[PDB]
Amino acid sequence: PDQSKAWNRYRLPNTLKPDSYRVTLRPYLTPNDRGLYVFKGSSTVRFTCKEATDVIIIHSKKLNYTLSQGHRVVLRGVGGSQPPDIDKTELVEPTEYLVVHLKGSLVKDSQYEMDSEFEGELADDLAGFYRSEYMEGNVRKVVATTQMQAADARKSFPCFDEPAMKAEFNITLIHPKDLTALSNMLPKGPSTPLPEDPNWNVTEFHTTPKMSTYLLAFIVSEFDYVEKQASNGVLIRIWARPSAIAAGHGDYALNVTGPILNFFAGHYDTPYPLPKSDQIGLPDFNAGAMENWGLVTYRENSLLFDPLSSSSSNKERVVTVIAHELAHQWFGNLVTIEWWNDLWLNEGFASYVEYLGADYAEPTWNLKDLMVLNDVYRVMAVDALASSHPLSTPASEINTPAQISELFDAISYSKGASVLRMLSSFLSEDVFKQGLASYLHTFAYQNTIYLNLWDHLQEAVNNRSIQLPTTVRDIMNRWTLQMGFPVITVDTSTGTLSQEHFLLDPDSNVTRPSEFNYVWIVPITSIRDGRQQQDYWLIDVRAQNDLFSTSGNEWVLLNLNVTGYYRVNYDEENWRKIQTQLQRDHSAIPVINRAQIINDAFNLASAHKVPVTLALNNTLFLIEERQYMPWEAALSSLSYFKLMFDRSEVYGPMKNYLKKQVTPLFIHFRNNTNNWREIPENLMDQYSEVNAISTACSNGVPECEEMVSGLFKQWMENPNNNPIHPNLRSTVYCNAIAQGGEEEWDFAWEQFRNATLVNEADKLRAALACSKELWILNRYLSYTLNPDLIRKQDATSTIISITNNVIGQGLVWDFVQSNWKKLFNDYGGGSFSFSNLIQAVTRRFSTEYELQQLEQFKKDNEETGFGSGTRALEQALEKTKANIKWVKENKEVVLQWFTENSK
Amino acid sequence: PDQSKAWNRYRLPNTLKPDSYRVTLRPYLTPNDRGLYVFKGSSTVRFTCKEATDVIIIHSKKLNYTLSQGHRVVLRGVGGSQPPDIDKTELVEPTEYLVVHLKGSLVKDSQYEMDSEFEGELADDLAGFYRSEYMEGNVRKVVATTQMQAADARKSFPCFDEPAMKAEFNITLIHPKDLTALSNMLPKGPSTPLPEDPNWNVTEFHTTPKMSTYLLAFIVSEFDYVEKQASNGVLIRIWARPSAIAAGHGDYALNVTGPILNFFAGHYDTPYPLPKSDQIGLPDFNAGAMENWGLVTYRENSLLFDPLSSSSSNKERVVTVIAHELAHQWFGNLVTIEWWNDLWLNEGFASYVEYLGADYAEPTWNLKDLMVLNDVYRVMAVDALASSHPLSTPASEINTPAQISELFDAISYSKGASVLRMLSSFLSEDVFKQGLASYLHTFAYQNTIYLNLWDHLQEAVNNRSIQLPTTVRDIMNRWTLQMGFPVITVDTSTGTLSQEHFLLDPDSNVTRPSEFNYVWIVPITSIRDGRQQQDYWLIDVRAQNDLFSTSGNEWVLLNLNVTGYYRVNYDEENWRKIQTQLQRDHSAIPVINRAQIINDAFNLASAHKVPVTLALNNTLFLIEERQYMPWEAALSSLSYFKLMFDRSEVYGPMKNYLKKQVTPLFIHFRNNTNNWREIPENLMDQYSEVNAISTACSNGVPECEEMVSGLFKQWMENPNNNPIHPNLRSTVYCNAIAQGGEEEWDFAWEQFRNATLVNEADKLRAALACSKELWILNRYLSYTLNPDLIRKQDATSTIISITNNVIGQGLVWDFVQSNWKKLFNDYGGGSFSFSNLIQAVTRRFSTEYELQQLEQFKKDNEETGFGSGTRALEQALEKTKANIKWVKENKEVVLQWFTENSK
Amino acid sequence: XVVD
Amino acid sequence: XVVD
Ligand SMILES: *[C@@H]1O[C@H](CO)[C@@H](O[C@@H]2O[C@H](CO)[C@@H](O)[C@H](O)[C@H]2NC(C)=O)[C@H](O)[C@H]1NC(C)=O
Ligand SMILES: *[C@@H]1O[C@H](CO)[C@@H](O[C@@H]2O[C@H](CO)[C@@H](O)[C@H](O)[C@H]2NC(C)=O)[C@H](O)[C@H]1NC(C)=O
Ligand SMILES: *[C@@H]1O[C@H](CO)[C@@H](O[C@@H]2O[C@H](CO)[C@@H](O)[C@H](O)[C@H]2NC(C)=O)[C@H](O)[C@H]1NC(C)=O
Ligand SMILES: *[C@@H]1O[C@H](CO)[C@@H](O[C@@H]2O[C@H](CO)[C@@H](O)[C@H](O)[C@H]2NC(C)=O)[C@H](O)[C@H]1NC(C)=O
Ligand SMILES: *[C@@H]1O[C@H](CO)[C@@H](O)[C@H](O)[C@H]1NC(C)=O
Ligand SMILES: *[C@@H]1O[C@H](CO)[C@@H](O)[C@H](O)[C@H]1NC(C)=O
Ligand SMILES: *[C@@H]1O[C@H](CO)[C@@H](O)[C@H](O)[C@H]1NC(C)=O
Ligand SMILES: *[C@@H]1O[C@H](CO)[C@@H](O)[C@H](O)[C@H]1NC(C)=O
Ligand SMILES: *[C@@H]1O[C@H](CO)[C@@H](O)[C@H](O)[C@H]1NC(C)=O
Ligand SMILES: *[C@@H]1O[C@H](CO)[C@@H](O)[C@H](O)[C@H]1NC(C)=O
Ligand SMILES: *[C@@H]1O[C@H](CO)[C@@H](O)[C@H](O)[C@H]1NC(C)=O
Ligand SMILES: *[C@@H]1O[C@H](CO)[C@@H](O)[C@H](O)[C@H]1NC(C)=O
Ligand SMILES: [Zn+2]
Ligand SMILES: [Zn+2]
C-alpha cells in the first residue's frame, strides 16, 4: 500500500494525543440467532491536537460501527473549538485504523471529542474482550474477560493504542444482574438496573490513573473470592471459579500477594497508588499472567494452588508469577516503556525483581540463585547467535504487532534480568534501589527509554561517590545496545585476560553493526583456591593483572556465583587444576560455579574454544554430586547432545554414560526418602530428587523403570487414591506411559479429560506425549487441534511436547510443513508463543536434508510469512548450519568418549 | 549421441552372426601391486557376414585391450575370405561396444575370425567374471566365478551378447595348480601345467552345445562336492565350501536334483543332452540362483540345507529353487527367448514348472496349491495398476540393460506362471505337456517368441479334437499382449456375468492401448453349494447363463481353486450367503476359495466395487480357521491396511481386532505342540503355526510376548544350545528384539557376525531390523553400507527390512532421497532387485506431503534417472495418489469397524 | 506479560 | 534367473 499516506504506516502520527476516554461495554454471554457471542459498546475520547491536521487516525480492530449523524463517528468541539465536518471514514485493515477524513484542519493546541458506537465478536480467541468458558456440573459458564497487551485494546474500542499515549479511562460495564463486573478501579457508586431491561445491571467504575491502553481490564463473571487488606492498606482479593475458591485453592495467593506488594513499595520507596489489587484466574488465557493495573489476570495454573495435589515446583511458579506481575505495578504500569523496542524496561525488570519479591515471601527456598539457570544460561543459548538482537532494538525496526509480540522473548526477559543482576552486583542492591527510587519518582505516570534509567542510576552513584571506570550509561550501553556477550579467556601463566564476542558458530555472519565494536566493559569477580579476590574491570580487548596469574597448585575461577553476563575460558592447565579440584573435593568450588564450569565448557566446545572431551570430563564428578544446580546445568547442556545424537549410534553410549553417572544419586534418594515415602525438606534437594528420577528412568536404570511402572499400576488399580507424591507426578506419569502401552495411555487420557485441577491436567497432558508408539503420537496430535478436547490456550504447548519426543520429531515437522497457513492464522502466528513452536520443531536439525527442508519451508511460505516467528526461523537456519558442522566434527570423538567413560 | 550411427543404437546390427568362440581366461586370485584383482584373457570369434558391412560392432564392457599388429583386434579370413584392413577401433561406452572400423566391406555369406587379447577387473561387483570371498579360519579364500545374465558376458570377453546370437563355446581356464576349474562342459583331456609357470594349470573344456552367451559359467575354487549319477545317466555334483560339504549340507540337494531332472526329461519327453549338471553354491551372489547350462549357480541359502538348523520354509526354498533352475534347462537353455521382451517364456515357465518338479520330489507337501498365494495374488497387486505392462512387451520398447533387468519382475515370473496354470487347467496337463514336447523338439537349440508356443499347443489341441471357442493364439493373446486382468461380476438373481479391466484406482489413466480393448476370453469354473458345475467360456463383456443364477438358499462361487487369472465379484445377496456359509461351516468352501473370498473382497473394496465393511466381514470366520492359506491371504491383504494405518488412530483398533481373531489359534498351537516342544506333521500346518505366532506377537497377545521373550532369554543364557525350533526362529528373534532393548540387539548382532549358516544369518539379519529404537535402526542402516559387516549381496534386502518397520520408514525414505547417486551407482541401479527398494520405501505413502516428496525426488534425479526402477517409480506415483484418496474415503468407516468388531 |  |  501507498507509504506516502499516514494511514498506511504502522506508527500513529504525532499530531493527536488523547487526554481521557469513557467507554461503555456490554457483553452478551449467550449466543445470538447467528450463533455468535457479541459485545456492544460506545466510547468518547477527548484528545488534543498537537499539530494541525485534516485526518483523525485512531486504532480499530474487528469492530463494526453504528452510523450516527451520517458517519461512523461524531466529532465535537471542546472549550469552544469548532471542528470541521467529517467528509468520510474508512477502515484500513493492515495498520488496524479507523481513519476520519475531515473537510478542514483541526487547530493546534485545541481539544476535541469523538463519539463512537460499535460492536465486536466476544470470540474464543483469547485477545481483546473475549470469552472464557468452564463447566460447573452440566451448566456452561461463560465469562467475558480481556487481554489487551500488546495491541488488542483497539479490538474492544477505538483508541490511540500505543503505550506512550497515556490517558485516564472511565469504564462502565453493562452485565446480567446476577454477575459481578470488575475493572482496574473500584465501582463508582452502586450498580443500578438498566432502564431498558432490569435483567441487566450498569456498573460504572472510578476514573483510572493516567495509564497505557494495554493495561485496561474488563471482566464479567460469577467468580467468588477471598480477601485481605495488605499492611500498606491496599485491599487484595483473589478471584476464581467458585469451586476453586471454596476448596481453598486461592489461599496461597492470598498469603503472599499483599506481603509482596508491601515489600516492593518499601524496597523502591514508592507507594502503590490504587485502592485495590485484584488477582483473578481465568480458565482460558493466552499468556501465563498479565499485570493489568488493579486487576491482574492469570492462567489458573499460575494463581491457584492445592497443597494436597500441586507440586513444590507448582508452588514456586505461583509465588514467582505473582511477584513478577506485582513488580510490573512499578516497572511497567506506574512507569512505562516509551515504545516496545525497549520492552526489557518492563519485562527485564519484572524478571529480576520477581526473585526479590518471591524471596521475601519464601526466604528458606533460596530462589535468587535460580537466576543463573533460569535466566543467564537460558538466554545465552540464543544470544550466542549472529541472528540474536540487542536488549534495546532500534525503535524504527519495531513497527507491526507481529514484530512487537516477537520481542516477548528470552532477550527482553532473561537477558534483561541478567544485566540487572550484574548491575545490582557491581553497584550493590542498596545503591541500585536508590537510583530506581529516583527513576520511579521522576517518571511516575510517564514513559521512559533506556537512557532515562542510566541517568537516575548515575545520580545514586554520584551521591555515594562510587568510582567506576566510566559513567553508568557507557558501561551499560555496551550490554544494552549491541547483541551478545563476551567470552573472557584467562591465561593463568601470565595473568592475561582477553574478551571477544562469543559465537556458538565461529563461521556465523554478524551483519548487525555495533558502534561499540562488540567490546564490553566487564566487572570481573574471581576466587583463588576458593577465596574471593579483589574485583577487577576489564575495559579493553586484552589486559594483564597478577589477580589472574597462578603458580604451583593454585587455581582461579572468574565470575563468582555467575553475577556477570559472560562466559569464561582458561588455559588447559587451569582447567586441569579445576578438574582435579572436582575430583579431590568438589565442595571447595561454590555450587553456582560448579554449574558454570559445566555449562561454560559445553558451550565453549561448540564454539571450538575447548575440546569436547574437556567439557565431557567436567561431568565426571557428577557421580558424587547431590546438589540440584550442577546436575541441572549438565542436563541442560546435554539436552543439545540428545537433540544431535538421539537418532544415531552415539545415543546408546550416551544413555549408558548418564545411567552410570546418576545411579548412585538415584539409590541415595531411594534410601533417604525411605523408599519414596517422604520428600526432602529443602526445595533444591526436592528438585535434585526429581531430576535424579527423570534421568535414571530416561537412561535405563532398571530400579527406576520398576518404580515408576509399579506406582502407575497401583494408581490404575485405585484411581481415586493416587499413591504418587505431587513432586514425582510429571516424571512418573511420563515414564510409566513411555514404558507402557495403550492401556496406560488411555487411563491417563481419561484422567486428563476428567481433571479438576489445571496443575494435574498439565502433568497428564505432557505425559501423554511420552508414548513411544507413532500411531498414538499421531492420534494425540489430532486431539491438540480439537478445542473440545484440548483448550486452545494449550494447543501449541502440547504440540511442542510431542515434537520433543524422538518418535514425534518427523511427525510434527511434517505436520508443520503441511499446515503452515492453519497454524499461522488460527494458532497465534502473530502472538507470544509462536517462536517456541518453530524453535522446538527445528532444534534437532543436523543434516543437509533437514536444512534443505527448512530452506524450502521458508521459500514456500514467503506469502504468508512467519509473523512473530520470523527471527526464530532465521535462528533455526543459523543453528541448523552450525549443527551439521558440529556433528561432523564431533560425532566420532563423542561416540568414543561416552563408550570409554560409561563402563 | 548421434542416432544415425549403428554403434550408438542399443540393438546389434543384423549384419553379423557368430558361429563359435574360443575363450581363454586367467583369473589372478591375489591382488596386484595396485591392490586390484584382475583377470587376463584372449578370444577368437568365428562369425558369418549376413549383409555386406564395413564395421564390426561387438559387445565389450570394462575390458582393456592389448594391441596386436597395430590395433585392438586382429581380423582374419576363413575358407579363403580376404577381409579388409582395420582402419581404427573405438570403445563406445553407453551401448557397451567395441567398434572395428574397416577400410572396406566384408562379403555377404562369408566367414571371418577376430582375435582379441584383454584384461578386466575381477571385481567384488557380482557381475561378469567376478570374485567371491570367504574365510576358512583366518585364511582368506578367493573364488573366481561368473554371472552373465542378462548382459554381462561382454564384461568377461568380447561377444555378440544377445540371446538369439547362439554359438558354440570352447573354454580354457588357466588357474592355480591346486584349484579346480569348472565350466558348462566337462574337461577335454587332462589338466596340464602352464609352460611359462608350473604353479598354474591349464584346463580346456569340451565344446558347448549351440547356446546363448548369458548361460556361460567359469568357476575357479577349492570347493568340495558330493555326487550321484541320476537315473537318466546324467552326473549330478553339488559343490560348496569344504566345511559345508563335510557337514552334509549338500546332501538334501543331492537327494532331489537328479530325480527332478529325470522327472522333467520324462514329463516333457525331451532328454537333458549334457553329460553332467553341477549345482554350486557361492558365498557372494547377486540373484537367488542362475540356470547356467551344465553349471547351475546358487546363493548358499538356496542350495545348502542343515536338517538340524534350517527351517521347513528353508527346505521348501531349496527344493523349489533347484526345481526352478532345472526347469530352465528346457525352458530357457535348450529353447531360448528371441529377445528379453518375451522373458516370461523362460521365467514364467520356470515359475510354473518348478512346482511340478518340487511336487515330484516332495509329494506330501502339496506345494502346487501355494501358486495361488505365491504367484496369482502376488502379481495381481501390481497388475491392477494402469502402469503395469503386458506379459509380452513390444520388443521395440526393450533396449537397454536397465530396461532388460527391469523385466525380471512379478509380471514375467508370477503372471507368466499364473497364465500357464490357467492354460494347463483348461487344456488339461496331458494336452499341455504334449504341445510343450512338440515346442521343445521343434525349437531345440533355437529361439522363440510367444506365437511359436501357441502354434505347438494348437497342434496338440487339434490332434485331440479339443473344441475351444477360438484358437489357442486368440485366447492366450488376450492374456499375453495386454496388461491386467478382468474382474468378473455375477448377478445371481439373473445369472448374468460381466467383465471389465480391474483397476485398483477407478480414476487411474490407462495410456497403453490394447488392440483387444481390455476384453478377455475367460475359462470360468464354478461350484454351487460346494458341487462343481459344468465349465463355461466368457467371450463377451456380458452374458447370461443359468449356471450363474440361484434361488432360495443356494450360493455359487466362480474360479474353483483359483485356476483362472481373474477376480470375482457378486451381488451383495450372494456375498451374504457366502458369509453365512463361512459362519455355518466354513469347511464347505474349498480352502483355496476361502483365501479367494478374502483376497478378492479386499481388492474389490480398494476399487470401490464392494464396501470395505464387506471385505472386513469376510475375515470374521478366521477366529475358527486353522488352515494356513486363508489366514495368509488375510494377512497379505491386511498388510495394506497396516501400511495405510500404522501411523494413525486406526492402528490400535486394527491390532485389537487381529489380537482377538488370532488368540484361539495361538492357544490351539500352544496346546497341540505340547507347549512348543513339537511342530505339526503337515507342512501347511507348520506354516499356519508360524503365522499364528507372528500375528499373536505383532498384535499384542500377552502369552505370545512372554513366550518369545522367555525363549530368547533362555538362548542368551545358553548361546551354544539354542532352544528355539528352526521354524520359529525368524519370528521369535524379531519379536524378542522388538520387545527388548540394546542387550538383545547386541546379542543377535554378535550371533550374526559369528554365523556359520546363511539360513541362520538371514534370520538374524531380518530380526535386527525389528528394533523399535530409532537410534538402533539408524546405526543398523549404517552397517548395511559396510561390506565388511553386511555382504554387498544383502545390503538392499536389509535396507528393505528396516523400511518395513514403522520407525524405519522416515529414516530410510530420507536416506534414499539424500543418497540417490550412491544407491544408483553402487547398489544395483541397473540390476534385478532395485525395483524392490523403491517399492518398499514408498508403499506407506498416503499423504499429499509424501506425494510431493516423491514428485520432487523424480524431478531432482532426472539426470541420474532410475535405471531398472523406472517403472517402479511410475507405479509408486500411481499408488500414492490412489492411497491418498483411499485413506480419505475409508479411514472413518475402518476405524469404526475395527473398534466395533474387536470386542 | 509471563509468556507460559 | 530367482531374483531373491
Ligand atoms: C472521565 O472522568 C473524569 C472524572 O470525572 C472527567 O474529568 C473531569 O472532566 C471535567 C470536564 O472536562 C473537568 O472539568 C473536571 O475537572 C474533571 N474531574 C477530574 C477529577 O479530573 C473526564 O472528563 C472523563 N472523561 C470522559 C471522556 O468522559
Ligand atoms: C579427558 O580425560 C581423559 C582421561 O583422563 C584425558 O586423557 C588422559 O590424559 C592423560 C594426561 O594427558 C594421559 O596420560 C592419559 O593416558 C589419558 N587417559 C585416557 C584414558 O585417554 C583427556 O586428555 C581429557 N581431555 C582433555 C581435553 O583434557
Ligand atoms: C570350437 O571347437 C570346435 C570343436 O573342436 C571347432 O569345431 C571344428 O571346427 C573345424 C574348423 O572349422 C571343423 O572343420 C570341424 O568339423 C569342427 N569340429 C566339430 C566337432 O564341429 C571350432 O572350430 C572351435 N571354434 C573356435 C572359434 O575355436
Ligand atoms: C458387515 O456386517 C455387519 C454386522 O452384521 C452388517 O451390519 C448389520 O446388517 C444387518 C442386516 O442389514 C443389520 O440388521 C444389523 O443391525 C447390522 N449390525 C450391525 C452391528 O451394524 C454390515 O451390513 C456388513 N457389511 C456389509 C457391507 O454387508
Ligand atoms: C461485522 O460485520 C461483518 C460484515 O457485515 C459481519 O460479517 C460480522 O458478523 C460483524 N460482526 C459482528 C460481531 O456482528
Ligand atoms: C445489581 O443491581 C442491584 C441494584 O438494583 C444490586 O443490589 C445488585 O447487587 C447488583 N448486582 C451486581 C452483581 O452487580
Ligand atoms: C497460609 O498461611 C496460613 C497462616 O500462616 C497457613 O496456615 C496456611 O497453611 C497457608 N496456606 C497455604 C495454602 O499455604
Ligand atoms: C542525591 O542527593 C541529592 C541531594 O541530597 C538528593 O536531593 C537526591 O534525591 C539524591 N538522588 C539520589 C538518586 O539519591
Ligand atoms: C583399464 O585401463 C584403465 C585406464 O588405464 C585403468 O584405470 C584400469 O585400471 C584398467 N583395468 C585393469 C583391470 O587393469
Ligand atoms: C594340475 O595338473 C596336474 C598335471 O600336471 C594334475 O595332476 C592335477 O590334478 C591338476 N589339478 C587341478 C586341480 O586341476
Ligand atoms: C537324503 O535321503 C536319504 C536316503 O533316503 C535320507 O536318509 C536323508 O535323510 C536325506 N537327507 C536329507 C538332508 O534330507
Ligand atoms: C499330432 O499328430 C501327428 C500325426 O500323428 C504327429 O505327427 C504330431 O507329432 C502330433 N503333434 C502333437 C503336438 O501331438
Ligand atoms: Zn512481565
Ligand atoms: Zn528363472
Is B302 in contact with D4 (Cβ distance < 8 A)?
Answer: yes
Contact criterion met (CB below 8 Å) for A714 and A702: no
Residue A722 burial (10 A CB sphere; 0-12, 13-18, 19+): middle
Residue B79: half-sphere exposure toward Cβ, Cα within 13 Å: 9
Alpha helices in B47-179 (DSSP H): none
Give the contacts of B148 (CB within 8 A, at least 6 positions apart): B128, B156, B213, B214, B215, B216, B217, B292
Is A324 in contact with C4 (Cβ distance < 8 A)?
Answer: no
DSSP string covering B782-803: HHHT-TTTS-GGGHHHHHHHHH
| Termini Cα distance of chain B | 66
Taking the C-alpha atoms of residue B103 and residue B89, their distance in angstroms, rounded to an integer, is 12
Cell match 529353487: residue?
A: B321
Q: Does B650 touch chain D (CB under 8 A)?
A: no
Taking the C-alpha atoms of residue A761 and residue A309, their distance in angstroms, rounded to an integer, is 11
Contact criterion met (CB below 8 Å) for B733 and B748: yes
Contact criterion met (CB below 8 Å) for B98 and B5: no
| Termini Cα distance of chain D | 10
Q: Which residue of A has its CA nearest to B805?
A: A774
CA distance C4 to chain A (A): 5
Nearest to residue A115, comparing CAs of A218, A209, A21, A15?
Answer: A21
The catalytic site residues of B sit at: 325
Q: Which residue of A has its CA nearest to C1?
A: A290
Residues with CB under 6 A from ligand 6: A 177, 179-180, 191-193, 201, 203
Atom of ligand 5 nearest to the CA of A120: 13
Nearest to residue B628, comparing CAs of B754, B537, B727?
Answer: B727
- Asked whether B191 lines ligand 10 (CB < 6 A), one says yes
Q: How many CB atoms lie within 10 A of CB B108?
A: 12
Is A646 in contact with B807 (Cβ distance < 8 A)?
Answer: no
SS3 B177: coil
Atom of ligand 8 nearest to the CA of A463: 1
- List all residues of chain A from 691 to 720 with a beta carbon under 8 Å from chain B: 700
Q: Which residue of B has its CA nearest to A814?
A: B849
**Beta strand B335-337 pairing with B446-448:** parallel
Chains touching chain B through at least 3 C-beta pairs below 8 angstroms are A, D
Contact criterion met (CB below 8 Å) for A732 and A752: no
Contact criterion met (CB below 8 Å) for A594 and A527: no
Give the contacts of B446 (CB within 8 A, at least 6 positions apart): B166, B335, B336
Nearest to residue B698, comparing CAs of B708, B711, B686, B687?
Answer: B708
Annotated binding residues of B for Zn(2+), written as ranges, equal 324, 328, 347
Nearest to residue A201, comparing CAs of A227, A183, A220, A184?
Answer: A220
Could you list the beta-strand ranges (E) of B148-290: 168-176, 180-183, 192-194, 197-204, 218-221, 224-229, 235-240, 276-282, 289-290
This structure's resolution (Å) is 1.9
Cell of B447: 529361439
Residue B549 burial (10 A CB sphere; 0-12, 13-18, 19+): middle
DSSP string covering A26-91: EE--S--TTS--EEEEEEEEEEEESS--SEEEEE--S-EEPPBTTBSEEEEESTT--PPPEEEEEE
Taking the C-alpha atoms of residue B147 and residue B665, their distance in angstroms, rounded to an integer, is 45
Buried b (16+ CB within 10 A) or exposed e, B505-522: beebebeeeeeeebbbbb
Taking the C-alpha atoms of residue A691 and residue B23, their distance in angstroms, rounded to an integer, is 75
| Termini Cα distance of chain C | 10
SS3 B605: helix
CA distance B394 to chain D (A): 21
Quick check: do B and A touch, 3+ CB pairs under 8 A? Answer: yes
Question: What is the number of the ligand closest to the CA of A78?
Answer: 1
Residue A785: half-sphere exposure toward Cβ, Cα within 13 Å: 13
Taking the C-alpha atoms of residue B893 and residue B895, their distance in angstroms, rounded to an integer, is 6
Catalytic option among A325, A354, A625, A689: A325
Nearest to residue B704, comparing CAs of B684, B676, B672?
Answer: B676
- Asked whether B44 lines ligand 10 (CB < 6 A), one says no
Using an 8 Å CB-CB cutoff, list chain A residues near B742. 652
- List all residues of chain B from 383 to 412 with a beta carbon under 8 Å from chain D: 408
Domains, chain A, in order of start with CATH, read 1-223 (2.60.40.1730), 224-484 (1.10.390.10), 485-570 (2.60.40.1910), 571-903 (1.25.50.20)
Task: Report CA(B64)–ligand 9 centroid distance (Å).
Answer: 6
Is C2 in contact with A346 (Cβ distance < 8 A)?
Answer: no
Task: Report CA(A103)–ligand 1 centroid distance (Å).
Answer: 29
The residue type found at A215 is L
Give the contacts of A587 (CB within 8 A, at least 6 positions apart): none
Ligand 14 ion: residues within 5 Å (CB): B 347, 350; D 1
DSSP string covering A796-830: HHHHHHHHHSTTHHHHHHHHHHH-HHHHHHHTTTT
Experimental technique for the deposited model: X-ray
Chains touching chain C through at least 3 C-beta pairs below 8 angstroms are A
Cell match 493516567: residue?
A: A210
**Residue A295 — φ and ψ, nearest 5°?**
-145, 80
Q: Does B739 touch chain A (CB under 8 A)?
A: no
Is C2 in contact with A832 (Cβ distance < 8 A)?
Answer: no
Taking the C-alpha atoms of residue A383 and residue B488, their distance in angstroms, rounded to an integer, is 70
Q: Which residue of B has its CA nearest to D4?
A: B288
Give the contacts of A381 (CB within 8 A, at least 6 positions apart): A410
Using an 8 Å CB-CB cutoff, list chain D residues near B832. 1, 3
Is D2 in contact with B321 (Cβ distance < 8 A)?
Answer: yes
Is C1 in contact with A287 (Cβ distance < 8 A)?
Answer: yes
- Asked whether B255 lines ligand 11 (CB < 6 A), one says yes
The residue type found at B106 is L
SS3 percent helix, strand, coil of chain B, rounded to 5, is 45, 20, 35
Q: Which helix (H) or strand (E) holds A869?
A: none
- State the Rg of chain B over Cα: 28
Taking the C-alpha atoms of residue B761 and residue B752, their distance in angstroms, rounded to an integer, is 5
Nearest to residue A650, comparing CAs of A887, A882, A894, A843?
Answer: A894
